[PDB]
């Protein structure tokens, strides 16, 4: 028998150029991260020190999953402003994550940049928000990389893979 | 990547002849084991077995290594007689084996049980309060493992946990 395909350990690290040193001006960097289907990406910062800007129009770290923009980060973790990431965790809405670091023409002070880490994790597609239709008619089974439905005794799974019909 | 392994990441277990009446004098055992790091989560969707004091006649024993996680029988729980309900069970580590034993006979036509299990990554970065952190500075959990990192300015010691200037 062809052995069961297990999870690839997709995880990594991102850091501003020259981290932990000052980061040059007018820098531009982009990273594209993806996890296997059935897996989302979790990312968080261990270090965040950028030029503070009212709407991060100067220096910044933008996180994006597809169209939606997860947040535009900037500012120092030391001053604990509102633009900084802090310890928040970020997740990709699909299985993709796009990160961009943007350094403008000059720095008020010697900002040390940022360091981030990410890791693929299993999406529990059995998880649904309060008041939303349950992912399965009868029973929901989540496993690594996917999920499936099952029926109570006396019933049988419909061709649609969710509906349970009496038998 | 993906750690090569014989057993599937998930599966289903059911008493003989489920959902019908399970034969008498039957004893079956299952061995569930996943790759290093991961652990197994198992739960029952259906549980209908003969009742008995300390589940002596018929039973479903869930053990992980040496420690016996729990023994089950009946349809409901009493004192010294535990019934699964919707509760969840986890393998201490990466190993979990099940045993279903039926004795000579049954008064009522018991339909047995159905169970499902799935492997899930362990968050070794997670620890029971009081215990020291797995890492001195930063803990990174990922599928199948983990590793530590240090604050800027510090470097990780040979032990891959403690951090120090330089
Ligand atoms: Ca600047
Ligand atoms: Ca899943
Ligand atoms: Ca019996
Ligand atoms: Ca892990």
Short mmCIF file of C-alpha atoms in Angstrom, two decimals, chain A:
data_model
loop_
_atom_site.label_atom_id
_atom_site.label_comp_id
_atom_site.label_asym_id
_atom_site.label_seq_id
_atom_site.Cartn_x
_atom_site.Cartn_y
_atom_site.Cartn_z
CA UNK A 1 0.00 0.00 0.00
CA UNK A 2 1.18 3.52 -0.87
CA UNK A 3 1.90 5.15 2.49
CA UNK A 4 -0.38 7.98 3.77
CA UNK A 5 0.74 11.50 2.80
CA UNK A 6 1.54 13.45 5.98
CA UNK A 7 1.99 17.24 6.59
CA UNK A 8 5.00 19.05 5.14
CA UNK A 9 6.48 21.20 7.90
CA UNK A 10 5.93 24.56 6.15
CA UNK A 11 7.32 27.28 8.44
CA UNK A 12 9.84 30.10 8.23
CA UNK A 13 11.35 33.42 9.21
CA UNK A 14 11.24 36.93 7.76
CA UNK A 15 13.39 39.89 8.70
CA UNK A 16 14.00 43.45 7.51
CA UNK A 17 17.25 43.93 5.56
CA UNK A 18 20.28 44.09 7.82
CA UNK A 19 18.29 43.06 10.90
CA UNK A 20 18.95 43.63 13.77
CA UNK A 21 20.89 46.65 12.53
CA UNK A 22 19.46 49.94 11.25
CA UNK A 23 17.54 49.48 8.03
CA UNK A 24 18.59 51.47 4.99
CA UNK A 25 16.27 54.08 3.53
CA UNK A 26 14.17 53.61 0.38
CA UNK A 27 14.14 49.85 0.83
CA UNK A 28 11.33 47.71 -0.68
CA UNK A 29 10.91 43.99 -0.02
CA UNK A 30 8.19 41.43 -0.72
CA UNK A 31 7.62 37.88 0.48
CA UNK A 32 5.00 35.40 -0.64
CA UNK A 33 4.21 32.50 1.65
CA UNK A 34 1.85 29.62 0.97
CA UNK A 35 0.71 26.55 2.86
CA UNK A 36 -0.60 23.31 1.31
CA UNK A 37 -4.38 23.36 0.67
CA UNK A 38 -6.24 22.61 3.87
CA UNK A 39 -3.64 24.59 5.85
CA UNK A 40 -3.62 28.27 6.83
CA UNK A 41 -0.56 30.34 7.74
CA UNK A 42 0.05 31.77 11.23
CA UNK A 43 2.52 34.64 11.53
CA UNK A 44 3.75 36.77 14.42
CA UNK A 45 6.55 39.21 15.20
CA UNK A 46 9.33 38.70 17.74
CA UNK A 47 10.77 42.15 17.06
CA UNK A 48 9.17 45.32 15.70
CA UNK A 49 10.89 48.72 15.61
CA UNK A 50 9.95 51.07 12.76
CA UNK A 51 9.61 54.80 12.13
CA UNK A 52 6.28 55.81 13.66
CA UNK A 53 3.71 57.28 11.28
CA UNK A 54 0.06 58.28 11.87
CA UNK A 55 -1.15 55.83 9.17
CA UNK A 56 2.15 54.12 8.42
CA UNK A 57 2.53 56.13 5.20
CA UNK A 58 6.28 56.37 5.82
CA UNK A 59 7.87 53.08 6.86
CA UNK A 60 5.70 50.00 7.29
CA UNK A 61 5.04 46.29 7.19
CA UNK A 62 1.86 45.33 5.38
CA UNK A 63 0.30 41.88 5.66
CA UNK A 64 -2.08 40.62 3.01
CA UNK A 65 -4.04 37.46 2.27
CA UNK A 66 -5.40 37.80 -1.24
CA UNK A 67 -7.25 41.09 -1.61
CA UNK A 68 -7.86 41.88 2.08
CA UNK A 69 -5.14 43.80 3.90
CA UNK A 70 -4.60 42.30 7.32
CA UNK A 71 -2.93 45.41 8.71
CA UNK A 72 -0.36 48.09 8.05
CA UNK A 73 2.20 48.00 10.80
CA UNK A 74 4.67 50.64 11.94
CA UNK A 75 5.99 52.31 15.04
CA UNK A 76 8.12 50.96 17.85
CA UNK A 77 7.11 48.14 20.18
CA UNK A 78 8.83 50.19 22.89
CA UNK A 79 6.38 53.10 22.67
CA UNK A 80 3.52 50.65 22.22
CA UNK A 81 1.60 52.89 19.78
CA UNK A 82 -1.41 51.53 17.85
CA UNK A 83 0.30 50.78 14.52
CA UNK A 84 2.66 48.20 16.02
CA UNK A 85 1.81 44.45 15.78
CA UNK A 86 2.47 43.71 19.41
CA UNK A 87 1.92 40.01 20.08
CA UNK A 88 -1.07 39.70 17.76
CA UNK A 89 -1.16 36.63 15.58
CA UNK A 90 -2.11 36.91 11.93
CA UNK A 91 -3.73 34.28 9.72
CA UNK A 92 -4.14 33.85 5.99
CA UNK A 93 -7.80 33.75 4.86
CA UNK A 94 -6.85 31.41 2.07
CA UNK A 95 -3.61 29.49 2.40
CA UNK A 96 -1.59 32.43 1.14
CA UNK A 97 0.23 35.31 2.79
CA UNK A 98 1.90 38.36 1.21
CA UNK A 99 4.28 40.53 3.23
CA UNK A 100 5.84 43.84 2.25
CA UNK A 101 8.43 45.95 4.06
CA UNK A 102 8.70 49.58 2.99
CA UNK A 103 11.51 51.95 3.91
CA UNK A 104 11.20 55.57 2.77
CA UNK A 105 13.91 58.18 2.07
CA UNK A 106 15.01 59.00 5.63
CA UNK A 107 14.95 57.94 9.26
CA UNK A 108 14.24 60.09 12.30
CA UNK A 109 16.37 57.62 14.32
CA UNK A 110 18.21 54.29 13.84
CA UNK A 111 15.25 51.90 13.60
CA UNK A 112 16.14 48.22 13.94
CA UNK A 113 13.41 46.84 11.70
CA UNK A 114 11.52 43.64 12.39
CA UNK A 115 11.71 39.86 12.67
CA UNK A 116 8.77 37.56 12.03
CA UNK A 117 8.03 33.86 12.09
CA UNK A 118 5.35 31.84 10.38
CA UNK A 119 4.12 28.29 10.35
CA UNK A 120 1.50 26.32 8.49
CA UNK A 121 -1.23 24.87 10.69
CA UNK A 122 -4.28 22.72 10.06
CA UNK A 123 -7.52 24.54 9.38
CA UNK A 124 -10.35 23.07 11.42
CA UNK A 125 -13.08 23.34 8.85
CA UNK A 126 -15.55 21.95 11.42
CA UNK A 127 -15.24 25.28 13.17
CA UNK A 128 -18.05 27.67 12.43
CA UNK A 129 -19.09 31.00 14.00
CA UNK A 130 -22.05 31.38 16.40
CA UNK A 131 -25.28 31.28 14.43
CA UNK A 132 -23.82 29.94 11.24
CA UNK A 133 -24.78 26.70 9.56
CA UNK A 134 -22.80 23.69 10.94
CA UNK A 135 -20.27 22.32 8.47
CA UNK A 136 -21.94 18.88 8.62
CA UNK A 137 -25.55 17.68 8.80
CA UNK A 138 -24.81 15.01 11.43
CA UNK A 139 -21.16 14.60 12.49
CA UNK A 140 -18.12 16.67 11.59
CA UNK A 141 -14.67 15.16 11.47
CA UNK A 142 -11.59 17.33 11.25
CA UNK A 143 -8.17 15.90 10.50
CA UNK A 144 -4.88 17.24 9.11
CA UNK A 145 -5.36 18.66 5.64
CA UNK A 146 -9.09 18.20 5.39
CA UNK A 147 -12.37 17.14 6.93
CA UNK A 148 -15.42 15.01 6.17
CA UNK A 149 -18.92 14.28 7.45
CA UNK A 150 -20.53 11.13 8.83
CA UNK A 151 -24.05 10.08 9.82
CA UNK A 152 -25.74 8.74 12.94
CA UNK A 153 -26.68 5.04 12.99
CA UNK A 154 -29.61 4.22 10.74
CA UNK A 155 -28.65 6.94 8.26
CA UNK A 156 -26.33 7.15 5.25
CA UNK A 157 -24.25 9.84 3.58
CA UNK A 158 -25.79 11.53 0.54
CA UNK A 159 -23.89 12.03 -2.72
CA UNK A 160 -23.32 15.65 -1.67
CA UNK A 161 -20.99 14.38 1.08
CA UNK A 162 -22.89 16.18 3.89
CA UNK A 163 -26.60 15.35 3.87
CA UNK A 164 -27.63 12.37 6.02
CA UNK A 165 -30.60 10.28 4.85
CA UNK A 166 -32.70 7.70 6.79
CA UNK A 167 -32.30 4.06 5.77
#
